[PDB]
Design a protein around this ligand. Structure first.
Ligand code: HEM
Length: 117
């Protein structure tokens, strides 16, 4: 699916091809940007505190659990996606890997089945 790797400050280190297709940002444009550029407010402005909080408490809210959330594309459209987060270490510092599964199709079918009674 789409895969993204960020350092402990939420900065995008790696951005896969599939992620480019999904979020609308090329790898070059993405790397160097905070991961918060991939979601809408209120998560966006709160994203750093989510990471800081985790690093301070070591009490996960998504790592090892998963969560369906709303991501944001370059053109500004929002969409539902399942997010899985793995934690890694490299060069003495933490890195996090996010696996994104686009759930738009699932949401759409579900809504269509509901509107037709
Ligand atoms: C792009 C859509 C995304 C949204 C909507 C989102 C949202 C969130 C939310 C709501 C939390 C937990 C806050 C709480 O419950 O207190 C969180 C935690 C975090 N997010 Fe994101 N996130 C996104 C993508 C990512 C990606 C791509 C990564 C990794 C590449 C990532 C890394 C983290 C980390 C490391 C934490 C803390 C982990 C934990 O609490 O267990 N996020 N995010």
């Amino acid at each position: 699916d789409a895969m993204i790797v960020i350092d402990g400050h939420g900065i995008i280190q790696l951005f896969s091809t599939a992620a480019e297709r999904l979020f609308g940002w090329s790898e070059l444009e993405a790397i160097g940007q905070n991961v918060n550029i991939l979601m809408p407010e209120p998560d966006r402005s709160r994203h750093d505190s989510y990471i800081s909080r985790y690093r301070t408490t070591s009490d996960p809210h998504i790592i090892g659990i998963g969560r369906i959330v709303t991501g944001k594309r370059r053109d500004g459209t929002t969409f539902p996606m399942h997010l899985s987060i793995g934690e890694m270490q490299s060069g003495g510092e933490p890195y996090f890997t996010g696996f994104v599964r686009d759930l738009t199709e699932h949401q759409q079918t579900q809504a269509r089945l509901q509107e037709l009674q």
